[PDB]
Enzyme design. Structure first.
Site, PDB file in Angstrom:
ATOM      1  N   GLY B  32       0.816  -1.195   0.000  1.00  0.00           N
ATOM      2  CA  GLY B  32       0.000   0.000   0.000  1.00  0.00           C
ATOM      3  C   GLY B  32       0.853   1.250   0.000  1.00  0.00           C
ATOM      4  O   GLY B  32       2.059   1.208   0.245  1.00  0.00           O
ATOM      5  N   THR B  33       0.192   2.371  -0.260  1.00  0.00           N
ATOM      6  CA  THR B  33       0.896   3.626  -0.446  1.00  0.00           C
ATOM      7  C   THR B  33       1.463   4.111   0.881  1.00  0.00           C
ATOM      8  O   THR B  33       1.297   3.483   1.928  1.00  0.00           O
ATOM      9  CB  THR B  33      -0.025   4.680  -1.039  1.00  0.00           C
ATOM     10  OG1 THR B  33       0.766   5.779  -1.496  1.00  0.00           O
ATOM     11  CG2 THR B  33      -1.010   5.163   0.002  1.00  0.00           C
ATOM     12  N   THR B  34       2.095   5.279   0.838  1.00  0.00           N
ATOM     13  CA  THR B  34       2.942   5.756   1.919  1.00  0.00           C
ATOM     14  C   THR B  34       2.364   7.002   2.567  1.00  0.00           C
ATOM     15  O   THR B  34       1.822   7.877   1.888  1.00  0.00           O
ATOM     16  CB  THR B  34       4.344   6.049   1.399  1.00  0.00           C
ATOM     17  OG1 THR B  34       4.906   4.856   0.844  1.00  0.00           O
ATOM     18  CG2 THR B  34       5.218   6.543   2.505  1.00  0.00           C
ATOM     19  N   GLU B  49       1.326   9.713   0.223  1.00  0.00           N
ATOM     20  CA  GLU B  49       1.838   9.378  -1.105  1.00  0.00           C
ATOM     21  C   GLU B  49       0.683   8.961  -2.011  1.00  0.00           C
ATOM     22  O   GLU B  49       0.548   7.808  -2.417  1.00  0.00           O
ATOM     23  CB  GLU B  49       2.886   8.279  -1.007  1.00  0.00           C
ATOM     24  N   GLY B 164       3.769   1.822   4.682  1.00  0.00           N
ATOM     25  CA  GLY B 164       3.577   1.613   3.263  1.00  0.00           C
ATOM     26  C   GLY B 164       4.818   1.141   2.528  1.00  0.00           C
ATOM     27  O   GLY B 164       5.702   0.484   3.083  1.00  0.00           O
TER      28      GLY B 164
END
Ligand SMILES: Nc1ncnc2c1ncn2[C@@H]1O[C@H](COP(=O)(O)OP(=O)(O)O)[C@@H](O)[C@H]1O
Lengths: 232, 246, 247, 249, 238, 264, 241, 241
Positions: B32-34, B49, B164
């Site tokens: 998953g994103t940050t 992110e 993430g």
């Protein structure tokens, strides 16, 4: 054997969910439907499949309220649940507050329903993705829905079987039909060359097509039947 | 991966003493994103992110930050709905507190609540752990705070935080700032260093075009409420990194 | 390439094909059931059913595939005759109470939606309901009837939810052969007596035994007389009428 | 070498027996010894304790417990399925018999209640029984003394002199050879020790055991004096210094 | 074969397995604490490990002062521990409001342990993977330790330990008590008892420590509480 | 040869060119070397020489390099029998292999075994499939009788290496043999430079020294860590075609490769 | 895949294998006998174990009681047997206080059996494995003798038995029975069977207990007599073991 | 396969299994025949002569009336048959209560099937391993009728029908003899029709039978053991050779 996919309680051995990830191939074995936006007027279009050379066609577009509607793609009977649900909230935030329900607030809680089925032992995920439009006191919008919960605010997308044969029209022509306003007669024409690129010889009979539109000074309303040979 | 028969459900300890199902959830956020958040002298900040699908996305109408009433903020990575079903309880849980105790909510006792609402969802068999890694912090009578949240339930009180894809990048890119600034920071000298980090993080994904959002709550520049950003602040804070790198 | 055999023992499990199977099997029970026919003129609707004589000592009116469900509506079971009774007890509890909550006569498209709002009660409820059934129950009704809004029409109501407005239905042990050829024997401009002929014809090509007043049954709708089914005597005289016509 | 029917407790095998109640009893053995003897004037109960860490204050725990002033109990098996059983028991002595008959129960109408606490475990699946098997001693004015046993299957025996736990078959053999039908009290205590000698390890003093008795009234324990018939208990457990001297013989 | 993925199934040899896994799931922290009485007091120490350099060390704590005159030091992972400390902070309202006065430690362990017993007869919950140690200063029986566990075998130790170094500490402690033949410790001052404790354990396992790598709890009468980096040199001052 | 190396009793690896221990290796000096050196006492007491030993602990400790090494000092034949690689699905033929080697060891005059991952023998038997678990003890039990029957030799020594001690509780096989059970260590921070001094040798590197290595070696206390850091730190001075190491590559190496040695 | 794991499943052969696996449980139990004759009903028993240090002297096991009229004999499990009689002892009194007279014996078993059927289908629950004998007297049918079965079907017998090796004991009863026996023809009969189909050669007074119903109340209703040991060790020696 | 160990799943042929496995249980039971004349109904049974220890004072009885103008007969297993008989007679006397009017026979017959439909649909439940049939007359008319019921929950109206052992021999037999071309009139031929129908199973035992008939005006009448014994002979009287 891809185990761990008997129910939506278990994770993958990586961090993935399979029953959800298997739902998303349900929309892919339904029909197609598409939706655009302008800064004043938005629209959606859908080809509805028959059952034989003699039957009627499938009620695919449904008025949840006047400032807002939808267009399903995939498993329909599980969509009627959601369609009844909006029809209660909209009929709740006008008997109490009298305020026009913000279209973005709708998708901001459907996601809080597709989740609470994802958790527990029983039932299923709402195996359908669908599109929402609507005008409000802020401006026109489009909001989609895929079963996993994630909704997104967009200018225009499409879903269903053989839909990416339309998305490229949009990504190719996006900069044009967003500034447009005041004249829905040609925006509505836009999707038709957008969708007609994505067909198995369907040829777009008048009966084989449904259109719905909203606007500031225009209510939600369906155009089907002989009033649609115009927009071929 | 080692144990096989004991992965099919919660509420099963592997003989080593370890419930693997949770050991699989946190392997999701890694896909998953940050997002990050760092403590300032006055208040705190937040970042994300964000990613895209095309130009079709409405610019700046698909926010990933979510808020709580009494000047308290939250952000979550991973499967965003589970991270939203959790904060949806937050705005439900404070009005069970300030309604009664006449006062806005402290942060640590609030974290305990979410820090064990999760626990129930890894204490049964007919449920699933929340597949997220949430971040939240804010202000109270006794200053500023920050925390981090994780499906095992083991939250902590950090200075800075991350999750993430971009952990290890921001594992050090944040660790430096505690070295260079024992004296603390302001929000103005912070956001000029946070959006730096996000761009350092995207280097792992140079193809996947992105977007950026920031939130910050302090008693100096906001007087103790939770506010977004706008105007020529992020228009230049970006440029505090868009030019710093290149 | 492990196959369907595993994800087919539970109503609430998809498969990587993206589909369910139990509901997909329910449709394969009406196939076992006897035939059923319904075609609609402008002058009136008709039906038609085989009755599957099991032995010559059964009072054939003991079992029913046709119901005077209301003044202006009819039905046609095909499949498990048992669980049909859980519909009509709910169906003609609506057509009545709609004459109470609105003091008027009903429209079918509520009714066929109502029963199809019921069949999906084994899972998510439409009106936020709960669960009351472990077993989607296999029958495929044919709700013929009249409303003053659009006139004479029929329908096809699966247990799988959705309905369709056929102009000429056929479901049971004959849907493959019959509904193939109604597609070349349907006219918008029929009489009534241009209708009961073929429905006896088509029901003859499809099944085992030679016809008789006992081994068939049929009915017709008309707005003024209602759900008037036909005696064995009257039905017998059309069968003879087919023969001398067939010469 | 058993399979497919010890998985649960609601499936009779073809042989015609229930699944794992037979296996609950397997721990009852693997717990420490125990015993109890019926005299003509009193009853006795006794157990050792192999306290794992010697740093433990062994006085805190008590194998023996109270149920009434007149009734007392002990197990041979699992521990934590005892200290809850008793509160679930003496709670029943009040609400069941006492507050609708005025005074305290006899032993068997207090033991029959214990069973209905037990069988409610073996009613469904995935809900285990109690890993213990008890014995109870008491007195009444109708039939006097008695010594009962309770098993996890709901059954409840009577007895006259018994042992359970590890030293069960060995002890009960000795009791048959060191018992009489018309003996006295004090010699019974002279038996139980040297019976408890049979399967002992480590020490044997009065600190590493706990045994109790029942007998004549002990009104010194009462404290609420001033009443003719408000008589005191028939229960008291013996202090280590009161035992460590008896051991001297 | 079953017998392991469920709680309420006995093996044919009698011993079930699932709790035994939880008895083993305490030491995923590699932490080992220690408790020891006094003459009117009691103290508890606790090793700390904050390797990463972004944790405000003040809030990381396996200590939870549940109420007046009570303390608790835990093993097992932190989240389950909060889920136990809460229930302790709940009963101490009730026993006060319902029966009038404050809970002694022994009851509070007896009560709490019955709850973790009930989760070895049914699948309401899984059993907590904790083994926790309450301390207090009783108004009647004096200072006390009690050592709980998941299944519910609680007992009162005169001075005990926990962690992966129990055998070692089990060695040297009892050696100390037999050099004087006493259960408790003399030398009233709860301060000075810390100097006894820490030096008794550094030499035990053999590693010197800082001030930013431990946390301690102290049980005087009338209050229980925690302390920061004061008194962190007298162990070496003399 | 068919099975194993056997070391020809003289392939002389250095049991002291190693950053291991002195106490343990001297604990082993008792049970092996003292009798084979000095039978004048066990004879004088009449006690028979010892029966084997266990060396628990997980890897990195070097719990196999010492074994063949001290065996090289005394000069016996070092072989293997990894129980993971001994089990066979058939009914017998797990015990036959046991019977071959005690015989074949005696075909040679001296011989010593190195079993490893012997928990495959000592299983908890939680499955309880009597078609199988009745046989698991069958092959195991044969070991107990094949190992100490009539063999009154002073040459045939035994070793068993067992990571995860006390996982076995079908039988602890305590009484009698296993005259030691060494309290194995891990590599202490002091031992790091005791170890780095080992592999660093045979290099021309301008030293490559530091005290920032045990801090780097903290929690990466396994011998493979140091073998590999010296490997890859050797691959970084050539990353630019340099001539001699810099110690920063060591401070870079252990910091940046113990990562896999701490997460998985 | 075989059809035994739950009692809510017919077999393809048309049978419910779990219930047979309950009706076999009583074979482990102890013998029980009843005889119906002119003057009044008799019963017998045999304790499964007859060891030393447990008193079966004053403690009846196989012969409980339901009312001064009716008494039973019991087999099978013991935990799933007490609750039945502790229901029967209620249902009778809840028939008395409402109708102000005594119970007809047929209604009791009709109400006590149809609950065992209740523990046969509705739920994943055990069927109570018990085979009672019922002995008593009602006016609309005179003397009576019924028998139960953990399925839930009963039968009005004349003189039968259950428990260990009843199949042989019936053969020792089918052919050597006479309806005109008064009492003691059934006694020396009854006690002769248990003497033949036992497990060991003791036949001690502790090993067995008897009971009786008698209409000897001269225009009063009925009497019972559950015999202490001193009334049954004297009779077998008075009968010729 | 595995498709047959529950009630809430379909095989790919579309048909459930646990129901028609009941039809294998009912095949293992005794006969139960019924016929309607012009103005009178009859009913039969394959009663057993098991042994000389059941009380002749009380013969058993498959048949069981619920009200004075309705009866019922069954086959299968008796325990699960005892229930719905009691839910029936309860329901009828309620219809007299609420409506001041007796029960039309069709209404009753849809109540017993109205439970055999739920006891298979909702799981957690086993069906009723029994088929039944109804017989009698409507009030205020002579209209004869009998209805059949089966655990799938459906109700038909045969004129003649049987259930159980060698029913296949019989349902073909009466087709060869009984017919609507000549409906019988009174008892002695409906019975002379029926007593011969049993003979495929009875193997010449007349201690193995019972019988009843029906009246108008809410009456019935049972029948004796000699009042067939002659009918054993007139039916054999034709069988001279
Ligand atoms: N004490 C030590 N000093 C130096 N190197 C070591 C030490 N222990 C292990 N090693 C290194 O690790 C390797 C041995 O691995 P080892 O831990 O023995 O595997 P196993 O434990 O499976 O036998 C050797 O090649 C050596 O280079």
């Amino acid at each position: 054997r891809n185990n761990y996919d008997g129910d939506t309680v278990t994770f993958s051995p990586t961090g993935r969910l399979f029953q959800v990830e298997y739902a998303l191939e349900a929309i892919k074995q339904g029909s197609v439907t598409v939706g655009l936006r302008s800064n004043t007027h938005a629209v959606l279009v859908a080809l509805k499949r028959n059952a034989d050379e003699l039957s009627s066609y499938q009620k695919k577009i449904i008025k949840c309220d006047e400032h807002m509607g939808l267009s399903l793609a995939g498993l329909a009977p599980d969509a009627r649940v959601l369609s009844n649900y909006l029809r209660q909230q909209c009929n709740y935030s006008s008997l109490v507050f009298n305020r026009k329900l913000a279209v973005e607030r709708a998708g901001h809680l459907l996601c809080d329903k597709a989740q609470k089925n994802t958790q527990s032992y029983g039932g299923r995920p709402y195996g359908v993705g669908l599109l929402i439009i609507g005008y409000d006191k802020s401006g026109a919008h489009l909001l989609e829905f895929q079963p996993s919960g994630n909704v997104t605010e967009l200018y225009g997308t499409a879903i269903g079987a053989r839909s990416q044969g339309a998305k490229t029209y949009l990504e190719r022509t996006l900069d044009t039909f967003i500034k447009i306003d005041g004249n829905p007669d040609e925006l509505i024409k836009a999707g038709v060359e957008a969708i007609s690129q994505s067909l198995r010889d369907e040829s777009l009979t008048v009966d084989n097509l449904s259109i719905a539109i909203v606007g500031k000074d225009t209510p939600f309303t369906i155009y089907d039947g002989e009033a649609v040979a115009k927009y071929i | 991966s080692i144990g096989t028969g004991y992965d099919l459900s919660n509420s099963v300890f592997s003989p080593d003493g370890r419930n693997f199902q949770v050991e699989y959830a946190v392997k999701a956020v890694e896909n998953g994103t940050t997002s990050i958040g760092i403590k300032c002298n006055d208040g705190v900040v937040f970042a994300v992110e964000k990613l895209i699908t095309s130009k079709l996305l409405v610019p700046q109408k698909n926010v990933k930050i979510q808020v709580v009433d009494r000047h308290i903020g939250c952000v979550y990575s991973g499967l965003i709905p589970d991270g939203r079903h959790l904060v949806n309880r937050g705005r439900e849980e404070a009005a069970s507190f300030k309604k009664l105790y006449k006062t806005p909510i402290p942060i640590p006792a609030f974290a305990d609540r979410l820090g064990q609402y999760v626990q129930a969802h890894t204490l049964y068999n007919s449920v699933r752990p929340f597949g997220v890694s949430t971040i939240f912090g804010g202000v109270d009578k006794n200053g500023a705070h920050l925390y981090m949240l994780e499906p095992s339930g083991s939250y902590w009180g950090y200075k800075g935080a991350a999750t993430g894809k971009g952990r290890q990048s921001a594992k050090a890119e944040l660790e430096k700032l505690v070295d260079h600034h024992p004296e603390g920071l302001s929000a103005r000298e912070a956001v000029k260093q946070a959006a730096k980090i996000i761009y350092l993080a995207h280097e792992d994904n140079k193809e996947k075009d992105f977007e950026l959002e920031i939130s910050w709550c302090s008693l100096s520049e906001t007087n103790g409420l939770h506010k977004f950003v706008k105007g020529d602040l992020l228009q230049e804070a970006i440029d505090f990194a868009q030019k710093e790198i290149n | 390439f492990l196959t369907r055999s595993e994800y087919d023992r539970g109503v609430s499990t998809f498969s990587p094909e993206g589909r369910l199977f139990q509901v997909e099997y329910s449709l394969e029970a009406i196939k076992l059931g006897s035939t059923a026919i319904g075609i609609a003129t402008k002058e009136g609707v008709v039906l038609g059913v085989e009755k599957r004589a099991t032995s010559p000592l059964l009072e054939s009116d003991s079992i029913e595939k046709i119901v005077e469900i209301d003044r202006h509506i009819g039905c046609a079971m095909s499949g498990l005759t048992a669980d049909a009774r859980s519909m009509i007890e709910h169906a003609r509890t609506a057509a009545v109470t709609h004459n109470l909550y609105y003091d008027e006569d009903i429209n079918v498209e509520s009714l066929t939606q109502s029963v199809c709002d019921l069949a999906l009660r084994f899972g998510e409820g439409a009106s936020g309901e709960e669960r009351l059934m472990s077993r989607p129950f296999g029958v495929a009704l044919l709700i013929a009837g009249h409303d003053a809004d659009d006139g004479y029409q029929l329908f096809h109501a699966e247990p799988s939810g959705t309905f369709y407005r056929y102009n000429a239905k056929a479901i049971g042990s004959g849907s493959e052969g019959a509904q193939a050829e109604l597609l070349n024997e349907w006219h918008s401009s029929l009489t009534l007596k241009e209708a009961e002929l073929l429905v006896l014809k088509i029901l003859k090509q499809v099944m085992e035994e030679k016809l008789d007043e006992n081994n068939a049954q049929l009915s017709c709708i008309t707005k003024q007389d209602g759900f008037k089914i036909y005696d064995n005597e009257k039905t017998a005289e059309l069968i003879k009428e087919l023969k001398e016509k067939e010469a | 070498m058993t399979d497919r029917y010890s998985f649960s407790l609601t499936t009779f095998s073809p042989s015609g027996k229930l699944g794992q109640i037979d296996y609950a009893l397997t721990a009852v053995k693997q717990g420490v010894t125990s015993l109890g003897i019926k005299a003509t004037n009193g009853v006795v109960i006794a157990t050792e304790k192999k306290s794992s860490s010697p740093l433990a204050m062994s006085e805190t725990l008590s194998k023996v417990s109270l149920l009434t002033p007149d009734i007392g109990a002990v197990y041979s098996g699992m521990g934590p399925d005892y200290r809850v059983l008793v509160d679930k028991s003496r709670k029943v002595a009040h609400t069941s018999y006492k507050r609708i008959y005025g005074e305290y129960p006899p032993t068997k109408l207090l033991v029959s209640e214990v069973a209905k606490i037990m069988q409610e475990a073996t009613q469904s699946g995935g809900v285990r029984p109690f890993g213990v098997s008890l014995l109870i001693a008491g007195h009444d004015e109708f039939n006097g003394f008695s010594l009962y046993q309770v098993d996890p299957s709901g059954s409840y025996f009577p007895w006259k002199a018994t042992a359970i736990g590890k030293g069960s078959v060995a002890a009960k053999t000795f009791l048959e050879k060191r018992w009489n039908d018309e003996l006295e009290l004090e010699d019974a205590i002279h038996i139980a020790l040297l019976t408890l000698k049979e399967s002992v390890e480590g020490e044997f003093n009065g600190d590493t055991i706990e045994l109790a008795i029942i007998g004549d009234e002990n009104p010194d324990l009462l404290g609420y004096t001033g009443i003719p018939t408000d008589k005191g208990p028939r229960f008291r457990k013996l202090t280590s210094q009161e035992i460590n001297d008896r051991l001297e013989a | 074969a079953g017998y392991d993925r469920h709680i309420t199934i006995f093996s044919p040899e009698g011993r079930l397995y699932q709790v035994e896994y939880a008895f083993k799931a305490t030491n995923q922290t590699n932490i080992n604490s220690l408790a020891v009485r006094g003459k009117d007091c009691t103290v508890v120490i606790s090793q700390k490990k904050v390797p990463d350099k972004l944790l405000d060390p003040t809030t990381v704590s396996y200590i939870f002062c549940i109420s007046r005159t009570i303390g608790m030091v835990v093993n097992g992972p932190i989240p389950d521990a909060r889920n136990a400390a809460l229930r302790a902070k709940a009963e101490a309202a009730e026993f006060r409001y319902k029966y009038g006065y404050d809970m002694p430690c022994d009851v509070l362990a007896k009560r709490m342990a019955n709850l973790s017993q009930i989760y070895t007869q049914r699948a309401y919950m899984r059993p907590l993977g904790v083994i926790l140690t309450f301390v207090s200063v009783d108004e009647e029986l004096g200072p006390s330790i009690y050592k709980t566990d998941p299944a519910g075998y609680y007992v009162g130790y005169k001075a005990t330990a926990t962690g992966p170094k129990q055998q070692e500490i089990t060695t040297n402690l009892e050696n100390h008590f037999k050099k004087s033949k006493i259960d408790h410790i003399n030398e009233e001052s709860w301060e000075k008892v810390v100097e006894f404790a820490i030096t008794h354990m550094i030499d035990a396992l053999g590693t010197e420590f800082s001030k930013n790598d431990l946390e301690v709890g102290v049980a005087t009468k009338d209050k229980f509480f925690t302390l920061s980096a004061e008194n962190i040199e007298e162990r070496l001052v003399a | 040869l068919v099975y194993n190396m056997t070391s020809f009793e003289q392939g002389e690896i250095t049991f002291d060119g190693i950053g291991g221990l002195t106490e343990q290796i001297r604990e082993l000096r008792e049970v092996i070397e003292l009798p084979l050196k000095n039978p004048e006492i066990f004879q004088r007491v009449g006690i028979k020489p010892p029966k084997g030993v266990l060396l628990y602990g997980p890897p990195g400790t070097g719990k196999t390099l010492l074994a063949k090494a001290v065996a090289a000092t005394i000069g016996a034949n070092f072989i293997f029998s990894p129980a993971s690689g001994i089990v066979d699905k058939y009914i017998g033929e797990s015990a036959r292999i046991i019977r071959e080697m005690f015989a074949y060891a005696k075909e040679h005059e001296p011989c010593i075994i190195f079993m490893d991952e012997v928990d495959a023998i000592g299983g908890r038997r939680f499955s309880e499939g009597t078609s199988a678990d009745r046989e698991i003890q069958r092959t195991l039990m044969e070991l107990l009788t094949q190992m100490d029957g009539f063999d009154n030799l002073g040459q045939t020594k035994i070793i068993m290496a067992t990571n995860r001690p006390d996982t076995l509780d079908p039988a602890l096989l305590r009484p009698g043999r296993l005259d030691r059970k060494v309290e194995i260590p891990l590599p202490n921070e002091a031992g790091r430079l005791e170890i780095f001094k080992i592999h660093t040798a045979k290099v021309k590197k301008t030293g490559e020294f530091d005290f920032e290595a045990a801090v780097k070696m903290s929690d990466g206390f396994n011998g493979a860590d140091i073998r590999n850091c010296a490997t890859e730190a050797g691959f970084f001075a050539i990353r630019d075609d340099r001539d001699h190491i810099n110690p920063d590559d060591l401070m870079k190496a252990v910091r940046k490769v113990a990562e896999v040695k701490k997460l998985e | 895949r075989r059809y035994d794991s739950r009692t809510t499943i017919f077999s393809p052969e048309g049978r419910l294998y779990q219930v047979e696996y309950a009706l076999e449980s009583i074979s482990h139990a102890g013998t029980a006998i009843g005889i119906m004759a002119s003057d009044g009903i008799v019963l017998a028993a045999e304790r499964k174990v007859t060891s030393t240090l447990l008193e079966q002297d004053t403690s009846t096991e196989k012969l409980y009681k339901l009312n001064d009229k009716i008494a039973v004999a019991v087999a099978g499990l013991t935990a799933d047997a007490e609750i039945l009689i502790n229901t029967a002892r209620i249902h009778a009194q809840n028939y008395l206080k409402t109708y102000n007279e005594d119970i007809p014996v047929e209604i009791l078993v009709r109400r006590l059996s149809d609950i065992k059927q209740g523990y046969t289908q509705h739920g994943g629950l055990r069927p109570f494995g018990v085979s009672f004998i019922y002995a008593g007297y009602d006016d609309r049918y005179g003397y009576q003798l019924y028998t139960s079965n953990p399925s839930g079907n009963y039968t009005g017998w004349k003189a039968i038995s259950v428990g260990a090796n009843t199949s042989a004991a019936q053969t020792l009863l089918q052919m050597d029975y006479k309806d005109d026996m008064k009492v003691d023809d059934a006694i020396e009969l009854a006690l002769k069977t248990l003497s033949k189909t036992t497990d060991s050669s003791a036949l001690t007074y502790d090993r067995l207990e008897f009971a009786t119903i008698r209409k000897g109340a001269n225009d009063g209703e009925v009497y019972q007599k559950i015999f202490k040991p001193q009334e049954i060790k004297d009779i077998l020696v008075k009968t010729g073991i | 396969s595995g498709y047959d160990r529950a009630l809430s799943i379909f095989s790919p042929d579309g048909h459930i299994f646990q129901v028609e496995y009941a039809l294998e249980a009912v095949k293992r039971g005794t006969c139960a025949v019924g016929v309607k004349g012009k103005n009178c109904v009859v009913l039969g049974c394959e009663r057993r002569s098991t042994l000389k220890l059941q009380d002749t004072r009380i013969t058993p009885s498959k048949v069981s009336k619920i009200d004075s103008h309705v009866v019922l007969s069954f086959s299968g297993l008796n325990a699960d048959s005892r229930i719905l008989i009691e839910k029936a007679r309860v329901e009828a006397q309620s219809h007299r209560l609420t409506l001041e009017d007796p029960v039309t026979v069709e209404y009753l017959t849809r109540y017993v099937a109205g439970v055999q439909q739920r006891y298979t649909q909702s799981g957690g439940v086993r069906p009723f391993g029994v088929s039944t049939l109804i017989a009698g007359f409507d009030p205020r008319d002579d209209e004869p009728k009998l209805y059949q019921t089966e655990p799938s929950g459906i109700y038909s109206s045969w004129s003649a029908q049987t259930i159980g052992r060698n029913s296949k021999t019989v349902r073909e037999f009466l087709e060869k003899n009984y017919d609507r071309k000549e409906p019988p009139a009174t008892v002695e031929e409906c019975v002379k029709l029926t007593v011969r129908s049993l003979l495929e199973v009875v193997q010449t035992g007349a201690k193995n039978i019972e019988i009843t008939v029906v009246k108008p005006d809410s009456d019935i009448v049972a029948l004796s053991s000699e009042e067939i014994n002659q009918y054993v002979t007139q039916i054999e009287q034709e069988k001279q050779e």
